[PDB]
Amino acid sequence: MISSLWIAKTGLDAQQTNMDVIANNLANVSTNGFKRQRAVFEDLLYQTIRQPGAQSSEQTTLPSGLQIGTGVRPVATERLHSQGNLSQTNNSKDVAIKGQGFFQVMLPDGTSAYTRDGSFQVDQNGQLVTAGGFQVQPAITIPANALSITIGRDGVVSVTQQGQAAPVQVGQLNLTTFMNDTGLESIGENLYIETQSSGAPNESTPGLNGAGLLYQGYVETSNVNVAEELVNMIQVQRAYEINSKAVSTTDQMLQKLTQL
């Protein structure tokens, strides 16, 4: 109903968004292949009133006119794509990426999502699947009579059968890379789908023109840093409290006026 109230009602909402981002980052501190978020803000409208640079006289200009501004709005929350620390949890079905590539996974509806999570399982039919049961691509089947699974640095999946001194190649794991990794649309379950801001999916082999390397027995942990999130909570809490104090001051000002 008054200008300062709207401005401080935008400040509250922006700080609440910042707290939401911080809390979501802290909640997923242990999920493998996670990329933490960062919210960015920008200034709202700026009411012109007296125009800055307006010609007051015929020879004197008015410097920096009465530019009363509106509150703040957040542009977006961008994913900080950095390499999480690798952990040696020593299982043949866990693979970790060393560069900037993504695994391709086929969704049940026929479309393809992209995930950096390397915790793979084997279904009842012998196909490699994501822990959520989504089958990986371009399909790597694993026989029932398998003794050991070896996934090399180039993505070649080999299976050694019983009593045979030579391994059997059962597929080739490829990595998808994008022009813009941030523009991908996250659909949950550690899955990202392609968006027009992410360019087009460029499939590549692990070690060539820019796909990362795969390490077997390793899991890529999250890049969330706990101490920085703690400090950011302390600063967001203070900013939210101060903006609420601005709301309260506006409320008190409106009280006296009405009482008059």
């Binding site: 509250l12 609440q16 707290m19 911080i22 809390a23 802290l26 909640a27 501190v29 242990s30 706990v226 999130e229 703690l230 909570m233 967001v236 809490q237 939210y240 409290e241 609420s244 709301v247 309260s248 409320d251």
Partner: protein, 49 residues
């Protein structure tokens, strides 16, 4: 696999890894409790307006 007679298959739980995981999990739980406490001190501040 082959059967070995007169021997038992012991568990595969390594204690050192379990202890360090317990420590890190405790710290993560405390951090989540801390952000829970912050959201309230924010809700309480909004209420006291």
């Amino acid at each position: 696999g082959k059967l070995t007679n007169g021997a038992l298959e012991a568990s595969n739980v390594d204690l050192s890894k379990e202890l360090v995981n317990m420590i890190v999990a405790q710290r993560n739980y405390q951090s989540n409790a801390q952000t829970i406490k912050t959201q309230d001190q924010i809700l309480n501040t909004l209420v006291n307006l």
